[PDB]
Structures are given as structure tokens and as C-alpha cells.
Amino acid sequence: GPHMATGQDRVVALVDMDCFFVQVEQRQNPHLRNKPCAVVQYKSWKGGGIIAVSYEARAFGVTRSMWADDAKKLCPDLLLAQVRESRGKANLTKYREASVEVMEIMSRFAVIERASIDEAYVDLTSAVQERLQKLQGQPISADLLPSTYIEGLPQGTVQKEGMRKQGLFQWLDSLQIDNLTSPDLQLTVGAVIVEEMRAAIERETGFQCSAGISHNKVLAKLACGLNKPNRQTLVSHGSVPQLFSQMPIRKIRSLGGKLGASVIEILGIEYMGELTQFTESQLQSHFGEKNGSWLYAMCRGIEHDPVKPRQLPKTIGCSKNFPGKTALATREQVQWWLLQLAQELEERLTKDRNDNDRVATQLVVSIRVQGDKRLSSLRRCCALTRYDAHKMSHDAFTVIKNCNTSGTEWSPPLTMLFLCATKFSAS
DNA sequence: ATTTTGACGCT
DNA sequence: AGCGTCAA
Numbered sequence: 001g002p003h004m005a006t007g008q009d010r011v012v013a014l015v016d017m018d019c020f021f022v023q024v025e026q027r028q029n030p031h032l033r034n035k036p037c038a039v040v041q042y043k044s045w046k047g048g049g050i051i052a053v054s055y056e057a058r059a060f061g062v063t064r065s066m067w068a069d070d071a072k073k074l075c076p077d078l079l080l081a082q083v084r085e086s087r088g089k090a091n092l093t094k095y096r097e098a099s100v101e102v103m104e105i106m107s108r109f110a111v112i113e114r115a116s117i118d119e120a121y122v123d124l125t126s127a128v129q130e131r132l133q134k135l136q137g138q139p140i141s142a143d144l145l146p147s148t149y150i151e152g153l154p155q156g157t158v159q160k161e162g163m164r165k166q167g168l169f170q171w172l173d174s175l176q177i178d179n180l181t182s183p184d185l186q187l188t189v190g191a192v193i194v195e196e197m198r199a200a201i202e203r204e205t206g207f208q209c210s211a212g213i214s215h216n217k218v219l220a221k222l223a224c225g226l227n228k229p230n231r232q233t234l235v236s237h238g239s240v241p242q243l244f245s246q247m248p249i250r251k252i253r254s255l256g257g258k259l260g261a262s263v264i265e266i267l268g269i270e271y272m273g274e275l276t277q278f279t280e281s282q283l284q285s286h287f288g289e290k291n292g293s294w295l296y297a298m299c300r301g302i303e304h305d306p307v308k309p310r311q312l313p314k315t316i317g318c319s320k321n322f323p324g325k326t327a328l329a330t331r332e333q334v335q336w337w338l339l340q341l342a343q344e345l346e347e348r349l350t351k352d353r354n355d356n357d358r359v360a361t362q363l364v365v366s367i368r369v370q371g372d373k374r375l376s377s378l379r380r381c382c383a384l385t386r387y388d389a390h391k392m393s394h395d396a397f398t399v400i401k402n403c404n405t406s407g408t409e410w411s412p413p414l415t416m417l418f419l420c421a422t423k424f425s426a427s
Numbered sequence: 428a429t430t431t432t433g434a435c436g437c438t
Numbered sequence: 439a440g441c442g443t444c445a446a
């Protein structure tokens with residue numbers, strides 16, 4: 001009772017851009033706005049591969065990883081924007097730069113953890129304390145939460161905005177605004193700040209986003225997706241038993257792969273809430289000490305992973321697949337594509353050094369061989385001493401060249417090349 | 428022929 | 439170090 005931790009110490013938000021690459025292209029090209037639209041990479045093979053889909057297009061069944069030719073069968077009027085191609089490969093610079101726009105706005109409000117190209121976690125605990133001091137017991141108006149859903153409410157009129165407002169009203173009517181240590185009040189103030197953040201993002205970039213507000217990263221991430229697009233969702237500690245009672249295990253971040261499948265198989269359960277019926281030692285016995293403790297706390301809504309102070313990526317990488325009959329089968333091919341990758345990498349590294357006062361010191365070279373189901377077949381490192389594309393490509397070849405069984409020829413043919421600059425030091 | 432990334436874990 | 443997992 002009085003010594004049971006409840007995981008209510010922090011206010012954490014997750015902000016994730018809505019159909020991000022599509023919005024970047026729609027800002028640039030007004031003809032694409034408010035249309036069924038997708039972003040594709042490459043075009044020769046089946047029209048290209050879709051990597052982002054507007055919500056209008058999702059209504060037709062268009063999804064990521066679909067070939068555009070196949071998406072056009074579902075949505076004949078689908079509009080397409082193509083990823084830039086430079087040096088023979090897709091180049092994501094436009095979206096990285098748009099990401100920086102958004103991350104720099106968010107960083108004005110609080111320390112952020114860049115979690116992907118289009119999302120960041122925010123630790124709002126201190127900002128909420130400050131705002132609560134400023135508010136001096138004044139109640140929080142629903143007008144301050146115009147796009148917020150309270151998960152689990154209303155409980156106890158047939159249109160969606162009416163439901164949202166009814167739930168928000170029940171929540172606010174129940175708040176105890178005279179207790180500055182109240183976790184529910186802290187989350188509510190967090191949601192007010194996130195409304196302000198999302199308004200600033202939209203005003204200053206044109207991009208819309210969704211957000212989750214809760215007490216930790218996992219719940220914030222889960223909350224964000226509950227009411228996408230262009231809305232934010234507050235998941236309180238008290239909402240967790242009902243929310244988790246029908247929540248498939250695979251929906252929780254880090255449980256969407258083999259571990260989550262093993263939880264389901266070994267324990268014979270389906271939903272996150274069912275995990276509460278195992279001891280911490282039972283869970284550690286099946287899934288290891290770290291995983292077992294994490295699962296024991298997480299199924300009760302408790303997680304302690306900190307929002308890390310890091311808004312810049314830790315690595316800068318360049319990769320290209322060579323599928324099917326395009327797999328590289330000659331030495332000259334391997335060297336030419338290593339040079340293309342190294343030239344893009346040099347451009348990005350030079351910009352990074354100027355912008356961010358740091359230098360990479362290690363070059364990682366990865367390759368996939370034809371037939372291997374693993375993303376990487378072989379990874380080798382060497383020193384990155386000069387931002388020089390010819391030197392980087394020559395070193396990468398030196399480091400991988402003895403994987404060739406025999407040849408001028410390369411066997412088995414290479415289905416992927418990957419260069420990654422790592423181990424940054426201040427400069 | 429689901430591509431191009433990027434973080435973190437294990438041994 | 440090099441390989442594996444999970445993820446957007």
C-alpha cells in the first residue's frame with residue numbers, strides 16, 4: 001500500500017508527425033494537399049515502393065510497403081510524390097531537414113529525445129511544476145485542451161467530437177486542482193503544454209502531429225496512436241487496467257517481435273493485462289532478469305526508461321539494396337556503389353560537422369550476400385580519419401574484399417551495401 | 428523485389 | 439568487436 005510504487009513520478013509526452021513524408025511533400029506542392037497521396041521510392045519496379053500514405057489514401061486501403069502499381073488498383077486517383085534520387089540512390093535529406101525544423105521547435109519547451117525521423121519524447125515534469133506554480137489553484141478550462149482525448153472516458157453524443165468533449169468534461173469535473181502533487185493534475189497540465197507545442201509546430205512549419213501524454217515513454221507512445229491524426233491523448237495511471245485488459249501484447253513498444261511472441265506462446269495469454277497474474281520471478285525465469293522485471297512493472301503501467309537528452313542522431317548511415325538480378329557481381333560494381341554511398345556520406349558528415357561541432361571517428365561497413373535472410377551478413381569497422389569519399393570507399397573495400405569467394409568477379413553477389421559513420425567526438 | 432535508415436542488447 | 443532485435 002503506502003510503499004507500492006505507482007509509476008506516477010514523471011510527465012512524459014510522445015509527439016509523432018502525421019503521415020510525415022506526405023505532409024512534407026504537400027507543404028512543397030499545394031496540388032497534393034487534402035488528396036489521397038503517397039510518397040514512393042524508385043519507380044521502375046512496379047511503380048515504386050510506398051513509404052508514407054495520406055489519411056485520405058489510407059481510407060482506400062493504401063499502406064506502407066505496397067507497390068504503387070498495386071496501390072493504384074485500390075485508389076486509381078492516388079497522387080504520388082517521389083523521393084529524391086541522387087548518385088543512383090534514394091536520398092532522404094528533405095525529410096531529415098524537415099525533422100530538424102520540428103525537433104528545434106519542440107526543444108524550446110523541454111529536453112527531447114529524438115526517437116525517429118518524425119517523433120520525439122518530451123520530459124515535461126519540470127515544465128508542469130512551473131506551470132502549476134503559475135496557475136495558483138486556478139481550474140483548467142476545456143478551452144485549453146481543444147484537441148485532447150482522455151482515454152477511458154466518457155463512462156457511465158453520437159458524433160466523435162461530442163464524445164471527446166464529454167470525456168474531457170468528466171475528467172476535468174473530477175480533477176483536484178488544489179493538490180499540486182496530484183498525478184492526474186500533472187498529466188492534465190502536461191496536456192495543456194503539449195497543445196501549445198503542437199500549435200507551435202503547426203504554425204511554424206505547417207505540419208500537423210499527434211501526441212500522447214502519460215507517465216512514461218511506453219504509455220505515451222501507445223497513447224499517441226489512439227486518436228491519430230491531429231489529436232492528442234492523455235493516458236492516466238488509472239486508465240491502465242481497462243486499457244490493458246484487451247490490449248494485444250504486440251502493441252506495446254519492444255514487444256512487437258520475437259519476445260512478445262514468446263510471451264504469448266509460453267504463458268498462453270493474449271493481452272497485456274494478463275501479465276499481472278505472474279510473479280516477477282516467474283517472468284524473469286521465462287524472459288530473463290531485465291525483461292522479466294520490465295514486464296512485471298509495465299503490465300501495471302510502470303516504466304522507468306528516461307527521456308534521454310539527445311535530439312541529434314548518434315550515427316549517420318547510407319545504405320542500398322541490390323535485389324534480384326541487380327545484385328552486384330563484379331568488383332568494379334562493388335567499388336562504384338561504395339563510392340556513391342561514400343559521396344553521400346561525406347556530404348552529410350561535412351554538413352554535420354559544421355552544424356553540430358562533432359566528428360565521426362569510426363566507419364562501419366556492412367554487406368548482405370545473396371541468399372541470407374539477415375539484414376546484414378557481415379559487418380567490419382575501420383578508422384574514419386578524413387571526411388574523404390574516395391578514402392572512405394577505398395577503406396570499405398579493403399575491409400570487405402576478402403568476403404569474395406573468387407573472381408574481377410564477385411561471388412556470391414552482394415544484395416546490400418551499407419556505410420555508417422559512428423563514434424562521434426566533439427570538434 | 429519491403430527500402431533506408433537508426434537505437435540498443437548480447438556475448 | 440561483430441551479430442542480433444526492434445523499430446519508423
Ligand SMILES: Nc1ncnc2c1ncn2[C@H]1C[C@H](O)[C@@H](COP(=O)(O)NP(=O)(O)OP(=O)(O)O)O1
Nearest residue numbers: 016017018019020021022051052053117118228446
Ligand atoms: N519502414 C519504413 N521504411 C522507410 N521509411 C519509413 C518506414 N516507416 C516509416 N518511414 C518513414 C516515412 C514516414 O512518413 C515517417 C514516419 O513514420 P511513421 O510515424 O511510422 N508514419 P507516418 O508519419 O507517415 O504516419 P502516422 O504517424 O500518421 O501513422 O518515416
Ligand SMILES: [Mg+2]
Nearest residue numbers: 016017018118
Ligand atoms: Mg508519424
Ligand SMILES: [Mg+2]
Nearest residue numbers: 016116118119
Ligand atoms: Mg513515427
